[PDB]
């Protein structure tokens, strides 16, 4: 049961993976960031229902199954309680990957944009991603958007191995 990771610099709303993770809000409504991009292309895969922080929910559409996952908002929560919720959030994703036997999945770095509190959280968010998704079988496309985050991302993924 071993997962794979690769990095992709681009708009996650254009991922070829059948299953895309959304960085969602508690309210389940769009959405700047990746959420706004996914709602722009795949409104079907949104239910617009609340989601508990640190939880996730699978919404299925004709084109894409989106796992809407709620990372902490570091504007609102402490660093410690945020690290819990971020782990929590990713773990919830892995749960859904494992329950549905999803084999290939595209995931953004939760809590690194709108919910970052204006701090670089690449490493932090990546670690929690790799830790939960390591419990999956999935080929994971980690999605970023800055060329520098790409290099840093690629380099960390590679270390592991
Ligand atoms: N289209 C995209 N494709 C890939 N990566 C993206 C995209 N848009 C943004 N990103 C990057 O994904 C990371 C996650 O940022 P956000 O999308 O802001 O998610 P998050 O920081 O968890 O904040 C979630 C909050 O934003 C709202 O849109 C959403 O409804 C929730 O309230 C950031 O590094 C950001 O630069």
Curated annotation (Swiss-Prot):
Domain Macro per the UniProt entry, residue ranges: 2-161
Superkingdom of source: Viruses
Location of the protein in the cell: Host cytoplasmic vesicle membrane
Post-translational modification, as annotated: Phosphorylated by host on serines and threonines.
Site (Cleavage): 1-2
Signal peptide limits: none
Residues the entry annotates as binding ADP-D-ribose: 11, 25, 33, 113-115
Topology versus the membrane: Peripheral membrane protein
Assembly and binders: Interacts with mRNA-capping enzyme nsP1. Interacts with host DDX1. Interacts with host DDX3. Interacts (via C-terminus) with host FXR1; this interaction inhibits the formation of host stress granules on viral mRNAs and the nsp3-FXR1 complexes bind viral RNAs and probably orchestrate the assembly of viral replication complexes. Interacts (via C-terminus) with host FXR2; this interaction inhibits the formation of host stress granules on viral mRNAs and the nsp3-FXR2 complexes bind viral RNAs and probably orchestrate the assembly of viral replication complexes.
Domain notes: In the N-terminus, the macro domain displays a mono-ADP-ribosylhydrolase activity. The central part has a zinc-binding function. The C-terminus contains two approximate repeats necessary and sufficient for formation of the nsP3/FXR complex.
Chain's role: Seems to be essential for minus-strand RNAs and subgenomic 26S mRNAs synthesis. Displays mono-ADP-ribosylhydrolase activity. ADP-ribosylation is a post-translational modification that controls various processes of the host cell and the virus probably needs to revert it for optimal viral replication. Binds proteins of FXR family and sequesters them into the viral RNA replication complexes thereby inhibiting the formation of host stress granules on viral mRNAs.
Record-given protein name: Non-structural protein 3
